[PDB]
Structure formats: structure tokens, C-alpha cells
Design a binder for this molecule. Structure first.
Ligand SMILES: [Zn+2]
Lengths: 131, 101, 147, 305, 69
């Protein structure tokens, strides 16, 4: 089942000193308080400023093995999918919270209202992005 | 025959035979890399790699683990066969191009 | 040495592995050097990705599971970090996979918050790669270093 | 993947074939296999070279073992198929047969020349047989070989190789046994003056580049690599196959932004030069065959527990 | 001492090329890089072998213990 989705709009796409990964900063279009930071293999999924990305975190998709004859899963609905771990939660204010994910090192920080991020737990999770 | 060429390393091969390690004498990267490339194309193979214990002992270690449809020994054989067939395709193609040249 | 008492002593008391820390100050004397440090900075870089084929090959080439470290008699692997458009593993996953195959299975994975020698500024804006994070035996952030 | 899918996609292109060197592309093959052929061509394709040198006399300035060594480096124009392998477990008498071994002799004495044009520097006119060449290795046929090799005497592939020099009174006298061997054992057996490959360069332009930039951009690559099109006036890639990957473009600031330099990862440009015994194509064929036998010999070996 | 037979890196025969290379510099009055090219030495591997050879043997040969100086 799905734990979180929102449409985000990208502010900045910083390639840092890498050339396959970029750090993305983006804000939600639906919540004024919900913002995002995410490392992306931009060689596999190019991103430019002002892009609008739909971003979904889900606990499962309805152990890993190469795709076979007629496999169907939640991944089919999206362009870019990553698997990772929630590793830190923090109080930002009386109202807002941030959760930290690592996808084999590519880091996400998702900040938002504590009711808007209610379903997120400190477990593993899939990340799904589509344009 | 020749029994000293390839042997099973029974201390890393499971009961069900869906996982196994082989030690092949007188072979380095040349065959090893080519063989793992071929084997990994087999859809029932879950894991495969080769290694060379030491540059000074002529030994090649292949590991195969399957998803349970065929045994590890099967995958080794399909891989070896696949590799042979692959060379044929190359030889034939090269021949034709030399003729047509 | 020429008799089993001396054998037992050389394997259990004066053996190299018994002597990781020095008695002077109680600090490490064994570690990797040169190529291996340079290699680590590269392999564990965020820019580092590997296909299924490469990932499995790095693992088997270094594990040597045909040893006394039959922690399992089957090599364990992680799922890829990127599922789609193409299955890719990161370098940090190679490390997690290594530890996963050589630490005891009946025992929780290591937990470490540490730092390395390279300042965040060197990687770019917003980097946290100076911070070394192991959670439940997995390298979640940071590169590995002489430190 | 599937062997038929491979057959349909694999392709060979032969740019130039010659008695000494071949230039050809293997397209849509995996690097592991291209590499195999390459390794095999250098190190496992048998060849004939001098292995044992028997001196009866050498009063030249060059020491025996060194002379022996150079003779071993001389590429003999011999078809390795015409020979069987030596079994190195038999005594010396049984070891060398007419199917095993080729015998070369060398027999020079240097004398002073009376008829030297007084005040001469040239050793050809000062001395008789001052210079000893590979061509001076005489092929002495043994047993059945008088017949078998009657249609193809044993000759060094490079006759004019300088082997030794002498002065009046010095002599060389030796017999050499030449046998099958492989490069992996010793490089004198390698049948190549080198087999290697390169991946086909990929120069992809990240936006049109025209006008005075086009001319500028074009000059960062060798002649013929980059074309300037008439009409759009924009630059395009003619053939990457001629590019040397100097990365010169990446120096000039204006371009470093607009070009990525890569490879077509599964497209190998092979260049094979023969040391002189077999043709390139034969050497490449022999390697593709050698790989296949490894796989076949292994499939048929019993796996001991 | 004397020309090497093969190029150390290429494997390419180079020992048939010394006497001619000298004749190219001498008779045809070419520069070194033009002459090397004319003998087929393409890789810098191989050009190095002939370009920098020292025919030291021609010195050794002047001491011949087997003739009345
Ligand atoms: Zn050279």
C-alpha cells in the first residue's frame, strides 16, 4: 500500500561535483509547508528546474529478481523507482516533521506537516517518480 | 577421461544442488569472464561470478546459484554449450565477410 | 614450530589476528594502504553504480565463501537501489553486502556514526558524504577512507 | 538473451585484410568475449620457434646464451599445423621426432678480404661474412620431412634480421631445434606483432554548432571525423571510427559545455598483425576455435566431488 | 649492443631495420622521424627501438683477439 504522494515542483538541480547524480530541491504544489531534497541518478532520469514531478513513497508494490514473463507491479505506473531505508526522523517545529531516507547513499529529506506525513514509518520503502 | 580439470567444492554446494562452486584448473580470466557472461543470461540463475584465488596457482573458481528450476550443474552445462554456440556464430559470420570482401 | 603445543600458541596467542591493537596505546596497527584507499573513495562515491552482473561479480571475487566463513552456504545479495528504468546497485551496497556475508547471521548488523577525512564542500552543495553512517550493518551515507 | 538473438544481431565488418595485417570490427558482441579472443590471439595460438640451441663453437663477440635468445625471437615461416607437440616427459633421444621438431643449422667463419678497396670503411668489402643474417639459418630436413616440407622450405619470415657480426678468425657453429609453443609460455611463440582492439568512439553533440564555431569545433578532431553540413551550416559527425580520442575539444571552453565523448560499448575495432607465419584471419579463426574448445573440453570433463 | 630482434612492447620485428635506417639517414638524407615511418615503424613503441639504438657492438668488434693488428 501507498504511504505518501504529492506533485512537487523543482527549484534547483545541482550536479555537485558528480556527473550522474544531482541534488534536487523541490516544493509541493498542494502544501505550503511540504518540501523535498533528493539525490537522483539524472543519467537515468534527467531533471531540469521548473519540472513537475509526481512523487510517491510506498511500503510495497502490488524478494527481488529480474523481471519475468508478465510481471505486473506498482512500478509500471512510474518512470523512476528506487528502494531504500528510513533512518532518521526529526521534529522541526511544533507543527512540522522531517524524515530521512537513504537509497544506497542517494539521500532524501522530506519535510512536511505531521498529519500530512502520518503514514511514514522507520522502515524500508520504495520511491516512485513520474513526470 | 580427465578428472583433474574441474571439481566441485562440496563445502559451498547446497543439498538441493541449486547452488555450487567449481574449481577449474588451467584457466584464467579468458574463459572465466566469458563463461560468467553467458551463464548470467540464463534466466534461472540468481547468482554467478568467477574469481582467481592467486595469479600463481592456475585455478579458476566459478560460483552458480539458481532460482530452483534447474540445478547449478545444469546452468554450468547450458553456459558451456551457449558459449560454444556463440563462437560458432562468430566463426561463421567472419567467414562470410571474408568471402564477401 | 614442531609440536602441537607450539602450534596452538602460534595460532591463538601470537597469531596476526590476535594483534590488531598495539599494547602501547591500544590502537590499530593493521589496515589497508595506497591503492586500496584511493579505490575506496571511488567505489563508495555517490557517482558509483553497478549492474546486476558487475555487482554479483565484485561480491564473489572478494568473499571467498569456500572458506571457514561459511556464515551461510549461499551468498546473500541486496535488492537494487534503482529498480526502474534499469536495475542498478550502488558502491555503498557492495560494502553492505560484504559485511552481510561475513558477519554472524544470528547477530544484528553494526551501528556506527563516524566521519572521514574529506570535507562535505568537496562533493558539492548539500553533501553529507563526510558523515559515515552504518545502520543495521548497511552503509547509508558517507565514503570510506584511510579513517 | 538467447543464442539466436545474438546470431541475428552480431555483425562483422572487414576494413582491410592483407597477408600481414587485418583491420576489422566485431559489432554487438560482449566485451568479455572480445577480450577472450584478444587474449587468446596473443598468448594461446601455437607457433613454431627455436627452443633449444646446440653450440659447437662461437668465438664471436656475442655470448652464446644471447645469440641463442635472438635466434629464438626469429619468426619462422612454418605452418604450426604441420607439426605435433613434443612430450616433455621422455628422454632427449625419444623427445625429438620428425613430427616434433625442425632443425636449423648455422655455420659461418669470418676471413679477411685481400681485395678490399684500400681505405674502405664498409665491412662487406673489408671482411667476408662479417654480418650474419636470419636467412643464413639453413633448414636441415629430417626423416619424412624431406617429403613433407619439400613444397615449403623453412625460411625465416624476416630474412634480413641482423643476427650477429664477426671479424676475421671468428666462427659460429650451431644447430637449433624448433618446436610448437604458445605466447603465454614465452613471447617468442606469440604469433602476433600484436593484436589489440579499441572501442568505437562516440562523439555526440548536445546542441547544434554552426558558423565559425563549426569550423573551430571541426579542427579539434582529426581530418574527416567532423563534417560541416551545407545548408544547416551545422556540424555533424562523419565517422567516429577515425577519431583518436585526444579529448582536444574539452580544452576549449566554448565547446566543453556542448559535447559528450563516449563509446559504442559493444563495437570493437580489432587490429591484428602477424609475426609472419600465419595470416591474420587464420590467427583470429584459430583463437575463436580455441575458446570454443575450452568450453567443449570442459563440458565433457567429469566433475569430481 | 646489436639491434634488438623484436620491439620490447609491440613484439614487432625490428632487427631487419637497422642497416636500412642508417642508409636512409645517410644516403637519402632524411630526418629520423621520416625514415622511421618509411620502415613501417608506426607505434611509438617501435619507433623508439630504432631511433635510440646504440650499435655498441661495432666498438666491441675492434678488439679481435684472433688477428694480428
Ligand atoms: Zn616498437
Amino acid at each position: 500500500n501507498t504511504l505518501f504522494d504529492d506533485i512537487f515542483q523543482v527549484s534547483e538541480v545541482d550536479p555537485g561535483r558528480y556527473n550522474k547524480v544531482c541534488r534536487i530541491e523541490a516544493a509541493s504544489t498542494t502544501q505550503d509547508q511540504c518540501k523535498l531534497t533528493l539525490d537522483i541518478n539524472v543519467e537515468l532520469f534527467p531533471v531540469a528546474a521548473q519540472d513537475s514531478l509526481t512523487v510517491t513513497i510506498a511500503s510495497s508494490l502490488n524478494s527481488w529478481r529480474p523481471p519475468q514473463a508478465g510481471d505486473r507491479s506498482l512500478a509500471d505506473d512510474y518512470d523512476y523507482v528506487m528502494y531504500g531505508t528510513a533512518y532518521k526522523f526529526e521534529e522541526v517545529s511544533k507543527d512540522l516533521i522531517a524524515v530521512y531516507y537513504s537509497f544506497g547513499g542517494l539521500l532524501m529529506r522530506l519535510e512536511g506537516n505531521y498529519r500530512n506525513l502520518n503514514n511514514l514509518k522507520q522502515e524500508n520503502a520504495y520511491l516512485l517518480i513520474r513526470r | 577421461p580427465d578428472r583433474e580439470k574441474i571439481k566441485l567444492l562440496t563445502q559451498a554446494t547446497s543439498e538441493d544442488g541449486t547452488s555450487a562452486s567449481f574449481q577449474i584448473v588451467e584457466e584464467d580470466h579468458t574463459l572465466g569472464n566469458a563463461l560468467r557472461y553467458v551463464i548470467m543470461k540464463n534466466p534461472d540463475v540468481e547468482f554467478c561470478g568467477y574469481s582467481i584465488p592467486h595469479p600463481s596457482e592456475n585455478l579458476l573458481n566459478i560460483r552458480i546459484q539458481t532460482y530452483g528450476e534447474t540445478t547449478a550443474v545444469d546452468a554450468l552445462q547450458k553456459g558451456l554449450k551457449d558459449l560454444m554456440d556463440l563462437c560458432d556464430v562468430v566463426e561463421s559470420k567472419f567467414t562470410e565477410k571474408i568471402k564477401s570482401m | 614450530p614442531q609440536n602441537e603445543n607450539a602450534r596452538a600458541e602460534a595460532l591463538n596467542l601470537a597469531n596476526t589476528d590476535s594483534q590488531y591493537l598495539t599494547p602501547t596505546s591500544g590502537s590499530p596497527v593493521r589496515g589497508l594502504i595506497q591503492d586500496h584507499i584511493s579505490a575506496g573513495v571511488w567505489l563508495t562515491s555517490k557517482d558509483s553504480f553497478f549492474t546486476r552482473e558487475q555487482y554479483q561479480q565484485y561480491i564473489y571475487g572478494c568473499i571467498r565463501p569456500e572458506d571457514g566463513h561459511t556464515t551461510r552456504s549461499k551468498i546473500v545479495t541486496l535488492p537494487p537501489t534503482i529498480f526502474k528504468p534499469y536495475p542498478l546497485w550502488t558502491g555503498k551496497q557492495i560494502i553492505t553486502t560484504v559485511l552481510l556475508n561475513v558477519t554472524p547471521p544470528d547477530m544484528p548488523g553494526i551501528n556506527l556514526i563516524s566521519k572521514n577525512k574529506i570535507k562535505n564542500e568537496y562533493w558539492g552543495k548539500g553533501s553529507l558524504e563526510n558523515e559515515v553512517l552504518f545502520k543495521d550493518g548497511a552503509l547509508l551515507c558517507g565514503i570510506l577512507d584511510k579513517s | 538473451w538467447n543464442v539466436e538473438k545474438f546470431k541475428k544481431d552480431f555483425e562483422v565488418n572487414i576494413s582491410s585484410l592483407d597477408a600481414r595485417e587485418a583491420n576489422f570490427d566485431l559489432i554487438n558482441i560482449d566485451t568479455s568475449i572480445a577480450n577472450a579472443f584478444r587474449r587468446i590471439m596473443i598468448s594461446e595460438v601455437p607457433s613454431v620457434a627455436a627452443e633449444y640451441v646446440y653450440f659447437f663453437n662461437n668465438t664471436s663477440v656475442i655470448q652464446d646464451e644471447v645469440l641463442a635468445h635472438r635466434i629464438g625471437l626469429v619468426p619462422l615461416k612454418v605452418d604450426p599445423d604441420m607439426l605435433t607437440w613434443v612430450d616433455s616427459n621422455l628422454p632427449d633421444d625419444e623427445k625429438f621426432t620428425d613430427e616434433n621438431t625442425i632443425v636449423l643449422s648455422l655455420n659461418v667463419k669470418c676471413t679477411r678480404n685481400p681485395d678490399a678497396p684500400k681505405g674502405s670503411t664498409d665491412p662487406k668489402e673489408l671482411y667476408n661474412n662479417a654480418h650474419v643474417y636470419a636467412r643464413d639459418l639453413k633448414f636441415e630436413p629430417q626423416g619424412r620431412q624431406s617429403t613433407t616440407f619439400a613444397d615449403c622450405p623453412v625460411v625465416p619470415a624476416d630474412p634480413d634480421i641482423l643476427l650477429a657480426k664477426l671479424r676475421p678468425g671468428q666462427e659460429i657453429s650451431l644447430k637449433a631445434h624448433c618446436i610448437l609453443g604458445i605466447g603465454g609460455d614465452h613471447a617468442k611463440f606469440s604469433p602476433v606483432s600484436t593484436a589489440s582492439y579499441r572501442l568505437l568512439p562516440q562523439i555526440n553533440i548536445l546542441q547544434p554548432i554552426k558558423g565559425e564555431s563549426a569550423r573551430r569545433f571541426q579542427k579539434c578532431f582529426p581530418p574527416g571525423v567532423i563534417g560541416i553540413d551545407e545548408g544547416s551550416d551545422e556540424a555533424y559527425v562523419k565517422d567516429a571510427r577515425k577519431d583518436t580520442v585526444s579529448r582536444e575539444v574539452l580544452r576549449y571552453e566554448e565547446f566543453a559545455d556542448k559535447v559528450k565523448l563516449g563509446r559504442v560499448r559493444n563495437h570493437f575495432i580489432f587490429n591484428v598483425e602477424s609475426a609472419g607465419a600465419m595470416t591474420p584471419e587464420e590467427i583470429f579463426f584459430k583463437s575463436v576455435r580455441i575458446l570454443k574448445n575450452k568450453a567443449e573440453y570442459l563440458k565433457n570433463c567429469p566433475i569430481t566431488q | 649492443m646489436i639491434v634488438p630482434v623484436r620491439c620490447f612492447s609491440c613484439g614487432k620485428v625490428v632487427g631487419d631495420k637497422w642497416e636500412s635506417y642508417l642508409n636512409l639517414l645517410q644516403e637519402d638524407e632524411l630526418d629520423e622521424g621520416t625514415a622511421l615511418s618509411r620502415l613501417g615503424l608506426k607505434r611509438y613503441c617501435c619507433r623508439r627501438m630504432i631511433l635510440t639504438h646504440v650499435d655498441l657492438i661495432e666498438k666491441f668488434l675492434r678488439y679481435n683477439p684472433l688477428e694480428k693488428r
